[PDB]
């Protein structure tokens, strides 16, 4: 058998409250906002958080890329709710911020959350117009993510425990040294550091963060778009996204003793699965389109199955299935895999 209670995993990103709700054309024109796009929130979008509410069908789910990926790992593995998965981030005490920090840990995710005052707790205006959705983001209190938590007993004794540390790219706009802060932990706790690349501009505008996390980082997880920039950052003039990830393992510093592991997806294409052994496809189930509700954390779901099947040790391979199943299952919205 395996007998296995799943490996300890700590979660650092940016946490957005999803203010969603079904909102009519009006709205939107209201708003200034073109459909399906993601937007940071302007003086053009001035109200919209206040007016979002007003509809009687607007719900309240904890969102942010980072956080979403926590989310699904742990709904993978629900007999563990308190003991498996680890958030950090920022909110702010604010009524926001208590529904995301109660509606997280209710699912089972230990919320190690900083309360600021500074900034309001973050949130994302998630527009609905039948199976489209429009994005109006503001990082607020995320991005105030200071060294005072960072050194707090509880985040150190957090990550002290934890054998899985996974930080999505975004940690990179905020400070580094708080990533680096979990790298050096992830060397001490012989455990296991995890980055999505989360953006191309990323790659583009925050390399130098970026250059400082990819020796201590074990495993790179980016899409198609993200790993093309990683290879236009890097100077790698190809679009051959598997030359990307082989060059990823061997081409890119690493100081790990773990091994350098690659999973660049490709949408509709095979997810490409790269370490020292070689290059390996893993192709993706076939879906029907008029029944993709919408990308939206797709990469974040692919990303939580994949975390929840290497907590409790799956090989690599197994992992990026796992990922699979969780990405089309929240694609198309207890576990059936
Ligand atoms: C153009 C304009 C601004 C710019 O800076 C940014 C810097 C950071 C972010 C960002 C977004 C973000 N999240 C948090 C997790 O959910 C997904 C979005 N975390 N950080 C977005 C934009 C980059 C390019």
């Given at each position: 058998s395996m007998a296995s209670?799943?490996?300890?995993?700590?979660?650092?990103?940016?946490?957005?409250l999803d203010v969603s709700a079904h909102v009519s054309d009006e709205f939107l024109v209201k708003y200034g906002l073109e459909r399906g796009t993601a937007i940071l929130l302007s003086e053009r979008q001035k109200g919209i958080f206040?007016?979002?509410?007003?509809?009687?069908?607007?719900?309240y789910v904890p969102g942010g890329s980072g956080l979403n990926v926590a989310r699904v790992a742990q709904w993978m593995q629900q007999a563990y709710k308190g003991?498996?998965?680890?958030?950090?981030?920022?909110?702010?005490?604010?009524?926001?911020?208590?529904?995301?920090?109660?509606?997280?840990?209710?699912?089972?995710?230990?919320?190690?959350?900083?309360?600021?005052?500074?900034?309001?707790?973050?949130?994302?205006?998630?527009?609905?117009?039948?199976?489209?959705?429009?994005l109006v983001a503001d990082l607020g209190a995320a991005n105030h993510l200071s060294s005072e938590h960072m050194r707090s007993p509880a985040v150190v004794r957090a990550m002290d425990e934890s054998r899985i540390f996974y930080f999505s790219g975004f940690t990179l706009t905020v400070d580094v040294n708080h990533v680096l802060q979990a790298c050096r932990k992830a060397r001490e706790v012989d455990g296991l550091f995890m980055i999505n690349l989360s953006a191309p501009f990323i790659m583009q505008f925050f390399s130098a963060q970026l250059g400082e996390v990819l020796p201590y980082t074990d495993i790179i997880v980016a899409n198609r778009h993200e790993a093309k920039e990683f290879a236009n950052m890097m100077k790698w003039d190809t679009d051959c996204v598997e030359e990307i990830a082989r060059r990823a393992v061997s081409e890119v510093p690493y100081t790990g003793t773990k091994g350098r592991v690659v999973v660049f997806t490709r949408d509709i294409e095979s997810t490409v699965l790269a370490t020292k052994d070689g290059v390996e496809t893993v192709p993706v189930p076939q879906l029907d389109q008029d029944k993709v509700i919408d990308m939206n954390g797709a990469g974040d779901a692919f990303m939580g199955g994949f975390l929840s099947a290497y907590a409790v040790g799956k090989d690599l391979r197994r992992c990026c299935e796992t990922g699979h199943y969780t990405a089309q299952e929240v694609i198309q919205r207890k576990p059936s895999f």
């Open positions: 209670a799943p490996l300890r995993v700590y979660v650092q990103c940016n946490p957005l206040d007016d979002i509410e007003k509809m009687p069908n607007v719900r003991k498996f998965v680890t958030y950090v981030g920022c909110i702010a005490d604010d009524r926001y911020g208590k529904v995301l920090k109660e509606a997280a840990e209710h699912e089972g995710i230990v919320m190690a959350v900083e309360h600021t005052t500074k900034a309001g707790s973050g949130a994302c205006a998630v527009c609905i117009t039948g199976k489209e959705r429009t």
